[PDB]
Amino acid sequence: IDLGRVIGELIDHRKLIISITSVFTLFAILYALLATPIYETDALIQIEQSAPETALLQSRMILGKTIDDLNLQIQIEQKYFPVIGRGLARLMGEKPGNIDITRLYLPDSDDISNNTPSIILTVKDKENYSINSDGIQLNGVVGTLLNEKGISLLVNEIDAKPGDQFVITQLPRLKAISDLLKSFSVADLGKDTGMLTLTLTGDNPKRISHILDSISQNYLAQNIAVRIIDNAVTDPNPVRPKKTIIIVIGVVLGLIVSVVLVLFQVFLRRGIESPEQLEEIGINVYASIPISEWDTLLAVGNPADLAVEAIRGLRTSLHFAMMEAKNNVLMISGASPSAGMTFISSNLAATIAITGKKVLFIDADLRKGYAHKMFGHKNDKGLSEFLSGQAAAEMIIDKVEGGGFDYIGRGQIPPNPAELLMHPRFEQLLNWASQNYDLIIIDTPPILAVTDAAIIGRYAGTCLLVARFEKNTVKEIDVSMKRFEQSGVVVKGCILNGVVKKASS
Amino acid sequence: IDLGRVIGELIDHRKLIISITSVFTLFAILYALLATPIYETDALIQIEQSAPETALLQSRMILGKTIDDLNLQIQIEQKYFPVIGRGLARLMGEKPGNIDITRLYLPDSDDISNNTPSIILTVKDKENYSINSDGIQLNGVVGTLLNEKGISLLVNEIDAKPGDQFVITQLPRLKAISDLLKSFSVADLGKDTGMLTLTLTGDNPKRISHILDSISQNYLAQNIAVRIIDNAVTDPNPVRPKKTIIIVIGVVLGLIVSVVLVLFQVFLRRGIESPEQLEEIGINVYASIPISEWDTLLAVGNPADLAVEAIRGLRTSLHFAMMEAKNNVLMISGASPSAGMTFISSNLAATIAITGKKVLFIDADLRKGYAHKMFGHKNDKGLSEFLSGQAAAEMIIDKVEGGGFDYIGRGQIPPNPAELLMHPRFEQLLNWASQNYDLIIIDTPPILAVTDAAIIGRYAGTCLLVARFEKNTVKEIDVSMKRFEQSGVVVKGCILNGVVKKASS
Amino acid sequence: IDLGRVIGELIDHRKLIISITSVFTLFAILYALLATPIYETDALIQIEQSAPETALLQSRMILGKTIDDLNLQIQIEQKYFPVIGRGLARLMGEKPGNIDITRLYLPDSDDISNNTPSIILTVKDKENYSINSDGIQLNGVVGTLLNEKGISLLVNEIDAKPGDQFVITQLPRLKAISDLLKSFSVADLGKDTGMLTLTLTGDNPKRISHILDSISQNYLAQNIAVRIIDNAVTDPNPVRPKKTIIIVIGVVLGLIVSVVLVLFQVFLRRGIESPEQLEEIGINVYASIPISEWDTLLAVGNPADLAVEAIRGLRTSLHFAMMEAKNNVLMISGASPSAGMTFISSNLAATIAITGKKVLFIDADLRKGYAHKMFGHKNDKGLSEFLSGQAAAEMIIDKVEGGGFDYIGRGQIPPNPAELLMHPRFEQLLNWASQNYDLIIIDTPPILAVTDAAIIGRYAGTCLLVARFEKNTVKEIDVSMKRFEQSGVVVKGCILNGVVKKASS
Ligand SMILES: Nc1ncnc2c1ncn2[C@@H]1O[C@H](COP(=O)(O)OP(=O)(O)O)[C@@H](O)[C@H]1O
Ligand SMILES: Nc1ncnc2c1ncn2[C@@H]1O[C@H](COP(=O)(O)OP(=O)(O)O)[C@@H](O)[C@H]1O
Ligand SMILES: Nc1ncnc2c1ncn2[C@@H]1O[C@H](COP(=O)(O)OP(=O)(O)O)[C@@H](O)[C@H]1O
Ligand SMILES: [Mg+2]
Ligand SMILES: [Mg+2]
Ligand SMILES: [Mg+2]
């Protein structure tokens, strides 16, 4: 391999790479702007050791005393239905509300799994609110305590706009202790000094400072039955999410997945890339027709098309190739269907007729031939009707309107096309036509599908294959040439079709 | 690869390398001369340990006491609108001013984000000043305190020229402590001694000394409720920016990016570099025409041009190549447009006519032919009009004024050029002309674009391709030769055009 | 590569290597003999630890007390205008003078940058002196103190010749302390003992001993409110500059830069080195003419020259090469101008005429031909006048005086040389001359520049190229041979010219 090839492949697939990288970067930006910020508060205490004090601070007694003091077993969560509602509310500048609950007691269903009872509180005004646990609706008022339906609740100082909802959960004490212990860290920072740094992370910058102050005070009171140097304060810059590293990771991930996909697609290509691939085997490529981005003939609708220019190049190439041929019959065929045989043949006939030579076009695709549709037709009396014997040699020839050449349609689809094409009346037709016309072009089905082309090619002076640019492979074209030679038909060469411009070439 | 090639490439691209390196060095010099200088002050104290004292010095209690003492929570910044205004003011020798503020209290909006209120003070004279916070204009006087609009301010000892502006911010205490702690360092320097080195970096050489003295005094007073050996002094040589290393890094970065760009451009070149590239394939290069830096013929305006000398070399080469040819018709063609076919053909006709031989020039570029413009014209009755049949063989031939040879213009642009060129009247014209002239030169469109050149080349005794120096590639020229041979036209050889002098060759 | 080639290259470039190495060694010797000597004084004290004492000795309190005691803040420098004046004065045996200043107080301008005020003192005699600070001239006398113009000065014991000048600077205290601390070192030398070695380097062998004694005494007095074993003494042998290592480094640096330059020049050579380089391609080198270090013909002025001997060798080689040639016309040409075509042709004609054969010399360089100047001329009626038709075949032939052969000059420079040379009168001239002379030699312009040589070579029986020894390359000669063959001219071979003797061959 070489650098030029890889750079060309990257240039060709630029749209895919850009789209994938942009999608990944957009997802990264959305996550980094919608993820909830996490603040960190710190405190510094002095040990008058410090190896067992790390375990004493994280023991369930200290944390449990803190949780009992601060009522951390009442989980209040602002209610947003979607997974991005909270982030959108924060971005729009909306101020989150809060409720001070000093007493909560749910009926404690305590089944096998749901060990955490929860209710939903809807704020109707600054004073009253509605409560629903499992569809049971109740009404409560700030101030006076509520003892109804096995539910006890005391709510103070609602701070939210009316219509807001809050999920109130009474999680078990061990769950609260585990949650507190997950986000709480103790370090020595000197490995020998009495200095201990206590760290607590959480999404509420004031609550975490209060929690760490309570932890420190409880530990201090417990020890004297240690010195608090730095009481806990919260860093106003969140520690998570780290937006810049997230976005950089997203961009690099997009680039690497795009490069992997591009390499995978490149290594899985088998189609023909250039005429030199065919010419390595020993197949003369007589032309390369580009894609015409422009039920009518292109050589007639848009005579100045680039594809028609390539076809004129093919015409002047054939005027020299088709010399010293046994007759004036040219047979266009191919390996696979929808390669361009009818396009090539019809347009070539048009470009050769505009130069003043009489041209006959025969649609010998007795199976899926649509030439009569493209030329303007009387569908009666095609090639089939002549071959089966129910027509004459003069009632099957029609004239293309915007063309300048005659044509013979397929006719009705027969049940035995390959056996009709073997009748000697076909050779009689070709011998008769080879005296009233200057050129005869025959369109045929593929050869890798059926065998009609190989029957027709016996009476053809020149035979050319059509290879589609990306679809067919060199193996298919070689197999087709060999199958034609096995049946006694000499293929003059190939015609690459549907070519497009690639920066890797 | 070899050393000579890389040295030649470096010599050829010297201008690009010099420009890029100079731009990078200029940017580095601008940064190193405009970046604000940062001074460093040091102190040395003695510990009568020293592992917890590093944490005690950087604790928020000591720094907070220092900040409360020195009022470091009032941030005063000189106002320069651009990002280089301060550096320019320092370079021009301007003395920065300062204000001693002993009391500031802003209304403390304290919204979600802007936790730091700020005002702008404009100095009108040595005594009075103007204040604007959010468009609210107020006037104040040094001395008497200001208590207006929820704003309290006491300003003493303004030292600046009138018209200067100062941004006064009241940043939060924790922000001030964090900023102080970011630029403050403590080290032991012996890992066992009681000697501690305290270091403080800042842009004001006196303020940092005062701050470090206050830090040391506060720590000393706290401990006795330690010895100060070296009170803080400031090194007058700034520690940042380090100009020499910055400039060296800039120069080396410029050199490496220039070398990378040069290597990238060299590895992405595909055009023809020397006639030997064409002669490897087996194409006889008959000449190499240099660029003529000098609507007129070069072989006439400047007969002593270097390009005309190369064309005379081509003329004497052709006088030997064109022997034993079937007729006296020469066809100049090419692979891509704007390669030099009309330049080469017209100048060659001029140089062959100055030697006393009758020369006919034909502009068979029926699509974009401008020869009549270059020769002085009566645009009627060109090649088109003759081919279509509406003109005679004698009404199309005109004479070049400063030339010495006849010519035939294209005429009106036809709708079917390639089909006009196939008429036998073209061959009749060439056969008639081959008896009244000594040489016939035909200019043609490219062959990779259209097929006109391949129609004309049937009646041409000699055919030569023109390859542009850097534009065309060996692949294009090989494809063109093969496409000409496929149509029965033997190409004698090639003509390299637009050559320039490269030190890598 | 092989050892013989590199040894030969080194022998060939011996002069360059010797010159570069001698220049580098001279610069090294000048630096090592003009750099100011730096003495080192040492002391040894005993610590009754020693880790904090290193920091206590280098603290600003001890050094500041020393500087206040010894007045190290008054910098007195002997005035020499050049950067080598002090070294020259020391080498000539001149004794430096000194002044004891016990009180200095400058006005202390104290601007942004110049924090060190300074004055210049000129010694008029043993008693009085002149002072200038910024053009303000004052006169002072030893003894009585000076208090004038904001300048206070007390000068004692001037020791210098009259007319000497001294720069007196009052540098800031911190600058003096930093300078003292830069050259002062403390070491333990045992890592555990109480022994401390104090080291001080400076250019005054007595002052540094006094300074180190003061440092030790101040530290000793401070500690007792330690034992001084070895009071400071100065090593009379300077520690810097180390002359021998400096000179060795200079010599080795010169050798390596010379070798690098030689290798770079060798790898950048492209010219022809030996006739075998041409004979590899398949070009017969018929001679190799050496440089003639000796407006006249060499074969006439100095017939026994070595170059004329090589030309006689070429003559006897040609007498065999030029057999079976179609006529007796020899054409000397070349690739690039100033290769030796006229030298070779004229001298060859002289050496062939001295053997009794009639020789005609033609100067067909119609552009820059100076043969008539070298032969003695009547500049009228040259080749140009004959070709244009305004002269006869007998009025253009002249006789060389000290030669023995006839010649034809170019004549007036024409506007169309290449088109004059194509006239059939040139062939008529050559055919007429080929019957009255035994040999005809034609001198021509280069072929890589113009095409005249290729026009003339059609009528030349033998054609030889001239390649200059170092200038031309094998590529140029191959291109020239190919361009001659493209135009139908067979080049018999080459002639290497301007050869010199190289030890690498
Ligand atoms: N170079 C081309 N540019 C534009 N359209 C093309 C080109 N080649 C084929 N086609 C069109 O795509 C369709 C498939 O080609 P077609 O020749 O009809 O199939 P088949 O090869 O099986 O006979 C057709 O409608 C044809 O007009
Ligand atoms: N060696 C050259 N030196 C100077 N100008 C040139 C040279 N070769 C081509 N040109 C000029 O650049 C333009 C493009 O060349 P041209 O021959 O006219 O295009 P084309 O090859 O398509 O016929 C022209 O204006 C031509 O005069
Ligand atoms: N081997 C040589 N020894 C001494 N002088 C030489 C030698 N070769 C050429 N020259 C002199 O150097 C100059 C350049 O050579 P010359 O033959 O005149 O140029 P050109 O090859 O273009 O005709 C001349 O003055 C010539 O006399
Ligand atoms: Mg079909
Ligand atoms: Mg053109
Ligand atoms: Mg000369």
Side-chain angles (χ1 to χ4, degrees), chain B residues 4 7 42-44 93 95 189 192-193 195 227 229-236 276 285-286 309 312-313 315-317 319-320 354-355, chain C residues 51-52 55-56 58-61 111-112 174 222 264 267-268 270 367 418-419 422 449-451 454-455 458 475 479 482 485-488:
Chain B
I7 294 169
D42 278 13
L44 179 81
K95 182 65 61 175
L189 180 130
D192 65 329
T193 67
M195 318 296 297
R227 185 185 168 198
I229 294 177
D230 278 352
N231 55 357
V233 313
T234 311
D235 196 14
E276 290 82 40
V285 185
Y286 281 89
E309 299 291 344
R312 290 183 186 97
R315 173 187 74 196
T316 72
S317 182
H319 183 282
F320 186 75
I354 64 189
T355 79
Chain C
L56 278 167
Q58 301 177 336
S59 61
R60 288 190 292 265
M61 47 175 307
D111 55 356
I112 307 182
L174 179 61
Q222 184 276 337
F264 206 69
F267 270 138
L268 292 192
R270 292 301 184 265
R367 302 163 180 257
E419 292 81 25
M422 301 182 59
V450 297
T451 186
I455 300 168
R458 284 198 292 263
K475 193 55 190 167
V479 168
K482 285 172 169 54
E485 294 168 4
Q486 216 160 33
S487 312

Side-chain angles (χ1 to χ4, degrees), chain C residues 3-20:
Chain C
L3 208 59
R5 173 76 182 279
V6 313
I7 294 169
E9 299 298 333
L10 293 175
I11 296 178
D12 286 327
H13 301 97
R14 53 189 167 172
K15 187 262 177 182
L16 178 70
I17 298 184
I18 289 305
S19 56
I20 294 184

Side-chain angles (χ1 to χ4, degrees), chain B residues 62-131:
Chain B
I62 308 297
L63 302 190
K65 187 158 54 181
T66 299
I67 290 186
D68 298 312
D69 289 6
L70 294 179
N71 295 284
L72 302 188
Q73 55 181 11
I74 303 177
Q75 180 179 359
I76 304 178
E77 180 172 346
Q78 184 74 274
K79 183 62 176 301
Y80 307 108
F81 67 94
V83 175
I84 63 181
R86 186 178 184 180
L88 291 178
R90 186 184 77 259
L91 286 182
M92 299 184 308
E94 183 175 345
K95 182 65 61 175
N98 62 330
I99 295 92
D100 294 329
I101 301 185
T102 56
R103 186 167 184 266
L104 174 75
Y105 168 73
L106 294 195
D108 306 331
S109 178
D110 306 336
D111 55 356
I112 307 182
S113 60
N114 175 84
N115 199 17
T116 71
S118 62
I119 70 180
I120 303 189
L121 173 147
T122 68
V123 186
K124 294 182 296 180
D125 62 358
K126 195 63 62 180
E127 311 306 317
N128 55 54
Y129 51 87
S130 181
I131 304 174

